[PDB]
Amino acid sequence: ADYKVYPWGLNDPTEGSRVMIKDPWDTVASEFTWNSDGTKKYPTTRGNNGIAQSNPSGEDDYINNHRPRSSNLSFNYPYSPSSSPPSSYIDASIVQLFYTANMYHDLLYTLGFTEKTGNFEFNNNGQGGRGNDYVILNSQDGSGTNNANFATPPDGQPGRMRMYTWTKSQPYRDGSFEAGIVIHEYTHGVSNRLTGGPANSNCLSTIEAGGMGEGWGDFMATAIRLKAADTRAKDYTMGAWAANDPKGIREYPYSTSLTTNPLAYSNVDGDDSVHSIGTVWATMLYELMWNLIDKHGKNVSAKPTMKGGVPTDGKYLAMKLVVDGMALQPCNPNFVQARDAILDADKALTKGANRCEIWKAFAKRGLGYGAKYNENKRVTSNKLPSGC
Ligand SMILES: *[C@@H]1O[C@H](CO)[C@@H](O[C@@H]2O[C@H](CO)[C@@H](O[C@@H]3O[C@H](CO)[C@@H](O)[C@H](O[C@H]4O[C@H](CO[C@H]5O[C@H](CO)[C@@H](O)[C@H](O)[C@@H]5O)[C@@H](O)[C@H](O)[C@@H]4O[C@H]4O[C@H](CO)[C@@H](O)[C@H](O)[C@@H]4O[C@H]4O[C@H](CO)[C@@H](O)[C@H](O)[C@@H]4O)[C@@H]3O)[C@H](O)[C@H]2NC(C)=O)[C@H](O)[C@H]1NC(C)=O
Numbered sequence: 001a002d003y004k005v006y007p008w009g010l011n012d013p014t015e016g017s018r019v020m021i022k023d024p025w026d027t028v029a030s031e032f033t034w035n036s037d038g039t040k041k042y043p044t045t046r047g048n049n050g051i052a053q054s055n056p057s058g059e060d061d062y063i064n065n066h067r068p069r070s071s072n073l074s075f076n077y078p079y080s081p082s083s084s085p086p087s088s089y090i091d092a093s094i095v096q097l098f099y100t101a102n103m104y105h106d107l108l109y110t111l112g113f114t115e116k117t118g119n120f121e122f123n124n125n126g127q128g129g130r131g132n133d134y135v136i137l138n139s140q141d142g143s144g145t146n147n148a149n150f151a152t153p154p155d156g157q158p159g160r161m162r163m164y165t166w167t168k169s170q171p172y173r174d175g176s177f178e179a180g181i182v183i184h185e186y187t188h189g190v191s192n193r194l195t196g197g198p199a200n201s202n203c204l205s206t207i208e209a210g211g212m213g214e215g216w217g218d219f220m221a222t223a224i225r226l227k228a229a230d231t232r233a234k235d236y237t238m239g240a241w242a243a244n245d246p247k248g249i250r251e252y253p254y255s256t257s258l259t260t261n262p263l264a265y266s267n268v269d270g271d272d273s274v275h276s277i278g279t280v281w282a283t284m285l286y287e288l289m290w291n292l293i294d295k296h297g298k299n300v301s302a303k304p305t306m307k308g309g310v311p312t313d314g315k316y317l318a319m320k321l322v323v324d325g326m327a328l329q330p331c332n333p334n335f336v337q338a339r340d341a342i343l344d345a346d347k348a349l350t351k352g353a354n355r356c357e358i359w360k361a362f363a364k365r366g367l368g369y370g371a372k373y374n375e376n377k378r379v380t381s382n383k384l385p386s387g388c
């Protein structure tokens with residue numbers, strides 16, 4: 001199979017060019033490839049991890065909606081961001097959406113989000129959990145604009161991603177080519193499944209937990225787009241291309257500068273917006289990630305190197321600790337509990353080798369030793385525990 005796409009790690013069409021990629025699946029994470037479910041091989045954007053199509057009506061049917069058919073699985077369709085209208089490149093759009101979602105399935109699998117932990121696949125090949133729950137991936141979905149969304153039922157019923165067209169530019173911009181938005185939405189599936197176990201999908205339903213829900217997706221999007229030349233001085237926005245706005249869609253850029261991004265845990269007080277709260281959480285995670293990269297180095301290839309189940313580089317280690325924390329934290333967690341789950345994930349993974357790097361990141365932004373959740377007036381702390 002060949003996919004003509006912006007490769008994994010390019011956040012949007014401004015960061016690079018499309019190329020032909022052969023057989024881009026991980027054979028271990030996608031043992032039937034992306035284009036089979038173990039029963040049928042599909043000459044289109046359908047297989048064990050997802051089914052992608054256009055959805056002009058914006059309704060709920062998907063099985064018979066349009067998707068490009070190629071009997072030799074050569075998915076090479078035209079696209080330029082200068083093209084208009086979006087319907088003219090729906091085939092390229094569907095293929096990009098399918099590619100990004102399946103690449104993310106494979107990375108997440110490597111990080112431990114597998115059939116038995118509640119992932120999204122049609123045929124689980126007897127590896128535990130409930131199947132029949134690949135992701136339904138709708139491109140150019142007619143139910144809205146200037147956004148995207150993800151619906152996560154309990155394990156065994158499909159996730160559903162709706163990608164919209166953005167109308168803040170002429171020509172319109174198709175959100176399926178902003179990998180960061182795809183990754184953000186898919187991460188809602190990950191966090192809702194892992195939190196409180198795969199049978200409970202209502203475990204991020206409070207305002208603070210819903211806030212982390214938004215932040216985890218912004219974080220994973222930001223981690224995936226990091227480039228080899230980046231240092232912690234790099235700032236990253238969210239959705240800047242699709243929204244046609246250099247500030248992106250959050251209040252401040254993700255930055256390790258407390259001037260560029262002054263957010264702290266106290267900024268959650270009185271905040272009624274999960275996207276705002278999620279900006280605080282993702283900013284804390286950006287801090288954590290760079291502490292770990294500065295300590296361990298960066299891997300900016302599409303697969304971590306794992307020694308004894310531990311990523312050797314800091315970027316993948318950060319992603320691993322964040323995903324592990326999701327499975328350890330209580331249902332409807334607060335930031336303190338989520339922090340503690342990441343610390344506990346590191347205890348389990350490395351015997352606490354990264355304790356101080358984790359505490360420093362969180363303490364920098366008011367979630368240090370002695371911080372306490374309160375619905376209305378949180379207790380902040382910049383303190384570190386003994387030894388850090
Ligand atoms: C999966 O499936 C899809 C199919 O759905 C595949 O995609 C299709 O890919 C092909 C390319 O292989 C596309 O065809 C190209 O279409 C464009 C227009 O859109 C044409 O310019 C191009 O025309 C050239 O090739 C054809 C066919 O060549 C085959 O058969 C010949 C004998 O019949 C054979 O000799 C040749 O080597 C091929 O096996 C040919 O008939 C044309 O004359 C033309 O070839 C000449 O020109 C090219 C330069 O463009 C030269 O490289 C080539 O050698 C020829 O050169 C001679 O003639 C020149 C004068 O014309 C002269 O200057 C030279 O000196 C020389 O004498 C193709 O028709 C097709 O459109 C794609 N898809 C679609 C939507 O149709 C995909 O590849 C496949 N993938 C996999 C992994 O299997």
Ligand SMILES: [Ca+2]
Pocket residue numbers: 115118119120121129130131132133155156
């Ligand atoms: Ca499942």
Ligand code: NA
Pocket residue numbers: 029031115121123124125127
């Ligand atoms: Na599987």
Ligand SMILES: [Zn+2]
Pocket residue numbers: 184185188213214217
């Ligand atoms: Zn979201």
